[PDB]
């Protein structure tokens, strides 16, 4: 906790760098997660689900 504070939080330059890197990771993973979830709740309804017939 001391270690974590000292590395990522104490210097604002480090804190802002950590926040932005986290935002980048969140953005990419959240995109993928929502995509999969949306496809499951709307299964068989989307073009991607019927495309194979054509």
């Amino acid at each position: 906790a001391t270690t974590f504070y000292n590395v990522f939080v104490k210097r604002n330059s480090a804190f802002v760098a950590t926040i932005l890197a986290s935002a980048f990771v969140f953005d990419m993973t959240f995109e993928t997660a929502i995509d999969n979830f949306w496809d499951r709740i709307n299964a068989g309804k989307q073009w991607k689900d019927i495309r194979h017939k054509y």
Binding site: R11, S13, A17, R51, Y54
Partner: protein, 75 residues
């Protein structure tokens, strides 16, 4: 016995000297990283960024290699 105090003047300019600035060099580094991550994040959507930078990153880079099927593309 000591006749005079022992000191020199370090080079300085606009009130900065090398001992001080050298302590801040790492901080500029991290700010540079923050600006780099931030900038890259801002242009992540730009197709050239994906094509030239992001898709080349090992393992992770396949996140940005996505093709529209030719059947689904009017253009």
């Amino acid at each position: 016995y000591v006749k005079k105090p022992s000191y020199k003047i370090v080079p300085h300019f606009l009130g900065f000297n090398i001992p001080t600035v050298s302590k801040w060099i790492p901080i500029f580094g991290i700010w540079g990283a923050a600006a780099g991550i931030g900038a890259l994040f801002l242009i992540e959507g730009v197709p050239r960024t994906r094509q030239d930078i992001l898709s080349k990153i090992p393992i992770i880079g396949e996140h940005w290699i996505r093709e529209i099927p030719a059947s689904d593309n009017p253009f």
